[PDB]
């Protein structure tokens, strides 16, 4: 059902043309359905929403003090970006050096939900593993969710291999997002500590 624990969840949305405008709406929906099943609060589950192409568009920050309802709305209002490339390396790097530059909330697990539907050019993957290892060194769990037949499988397998908690969810389409939404929310919640 619902998650009331200490967690810092970062939604990373593939912003490539690999996802149609309509498909990206399904993705954004799943993200909002998720926020609905999380206890969004600075004392419980904090959320950040970022859409990624060549760069990152941060719509919600973990420190953003806005009513959950407001945050779910902002999420639903995430502009579609049909870029030819959505750099996973760049988002993890951005997640690493920007989002988790400092760990202000050690009492919370950190999960980077990497919703991916594309595959960046190899030259962009050069430091891929190094970024995933850097995240691991801040204890930021990286959960990869493959969507569609273009989601970088190599990188998905590679992320699972970097750390034991990095579990992957490989879906055939944004339509499976809803069917698995609950198992995904459960897993992420179970990687978080309840609070006393």
């Amino acid at each position: 059902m619902y998650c009331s624990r200490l967690l810092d969840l970062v939604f990373l949305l593939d912003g490539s043309s690999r996802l149609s405008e309509a498909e990206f709406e399904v993705l954004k929906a799943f993200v909002v359905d998720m926020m609905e099943r999380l206890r969004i609060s600075q004392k419980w589950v904090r959320v950040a929403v970022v859409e990624y192409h060549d760069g990152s568009h941060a719509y919600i920050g973990l420190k953003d003090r806005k009513r959950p309802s407001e945050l779910r709305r902002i999420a639903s209002q995430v502009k579609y970006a049909g870029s030819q490339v959505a750099s996973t390396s760049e988002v993890l790097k951005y997640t690493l050096f920007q989002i988790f530059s400092k760990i202000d909330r050690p009492e919370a697990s950190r999960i980077a939900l990497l919703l991916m539907a594309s595959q960046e050019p190899q030259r962009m993957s050069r430091n891929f593993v190094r970024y995933v290892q850097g995240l691991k060194k801040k204890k930021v769990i990286v959960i990869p969710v493959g969507i569609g037949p273009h989601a970088n499988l190599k990188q998905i397998r590679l992320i699972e291999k970097q750390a034991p908690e990095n579990k992957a969810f490989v879906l055939s389409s944004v339509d499976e997002l809803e069917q698995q939404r609950d198992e995904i929310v459960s897993y992420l919640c179970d990687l978080a500590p309840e609070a006393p």
Partner: antibody
Amino acid sequence: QVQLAESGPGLVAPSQSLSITCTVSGFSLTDYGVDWVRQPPGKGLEWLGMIWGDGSTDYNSALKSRLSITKDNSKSQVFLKMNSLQTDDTARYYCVRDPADYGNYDYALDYWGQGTSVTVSS
Amino acid sequence: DIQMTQSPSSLSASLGDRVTISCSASQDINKYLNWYQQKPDGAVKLLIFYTSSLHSGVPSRFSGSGSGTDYSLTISNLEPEDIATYYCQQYEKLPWTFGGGTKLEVKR
């Protein structure tokens, strides 16, 4: 087995361009990358750029975007193209294989070619 | 550009000698260092990669070590065919940069 052979112009007038084809053998260009390294006379080695198995490339910013590396997987050939060559671009140019395996962060220049000398003067 | 420094450019040794070539980096390069050999006839070959792994067919007299900013290549017993120039190269950050090189010279 693994081989790499250069075929260059030998000579190049200033302002002109250098075109070198690297004929590789003993491996598939979809599996490995290919780098270009040059050595100015009486000087050390210099890394120019490379082209991954998928075709993406990486260039040495110092070349002021004068370099282009493309290839033809079927013809096991990688083409280097450099614009506006100056005298100080005179050097022996080698095409070198490299794993281009970001999975293992493995980019060693494991197998080099004999190289080709390039003299740039009027 | 990470600057790779190989202090001695010329290194006199005697066959049988144990030789050590040093390479230092302008910054921490997390053991992302390779060692290359260019024989007098111009041939270049990779000897050691990732600081200490020997490349296929490379004799065990060659060994590499180091971490952080200081690395080195060692030839346990110098063989004649080992007379050549040695270059270290970092792959910590693009573009890849080589050291100035160290040419082995025979003592007489």
